[PDB]
Design a protein around this ligand. Sequence first.
Ligand SMILES: *[C@@H]1O[C@H](CO)[C@@H](O[C@@H]2O[C@H](CO)[C@@H](O[C@@H]3O[C@H](CO)[C@@H](O)[C@H](O)[C@@H]3O)[C@H](O)[C@H]2NC(C)=O)[C@H](O)[C@H]1NC(C)=O
Lengths: 49, 48
Amino acid sequence: VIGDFNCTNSFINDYNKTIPRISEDVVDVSLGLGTYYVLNRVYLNTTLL
Amino acid sequence: SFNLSSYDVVYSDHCFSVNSDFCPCADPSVVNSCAKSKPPSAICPAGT
Ligand SMILES: *[C@@H]1O[C@H](CO)[C@@H](O[C@@H]2O[C@H](CO)[C@@H](O[C@@H]3O[C@H](CO)[C@@H](O)[C@H](O)[C@@H]3O)[C@H](O)[C@H]2NC(C)=O)[C@H](O)[C@H]1NC(C)=O
């Protein structure tokens, strides 16, 4: 249940398993995943914390 | 609407937070009890 309205009242099941397919690969950030650029800055050829 | 005068300002004193699934709605199975202090009941929509 998300909202408090009835869009459609047909084709409703009762129960199931619905196991989430959790990925076995952990979050890998060694390539740059999950990072963004600083606002209005360049930071050319350097390392920064 | 807070019915007040033409130059009245309303300010809060104690602000209480609560989760999304909440409503002061008693379950319809409160017809009678042994405490004789039954509160009024009302059906609340699904999702709480
Ligand atoms: C804002 O959201 C609320 C909650 O979804 C809306 O209230 C709901 O409005 C619908 C449409 O009027 C009601 O459905 C009707 O219910 C009557 C019985 O009361 C039934 O005879 C009709 O055939 C129809 O199904 C619904 O009951 C009502 N729910 C609640 C809890 O009040 C409200 O209309 C929304 N307002 C706006 C401006 O979108």
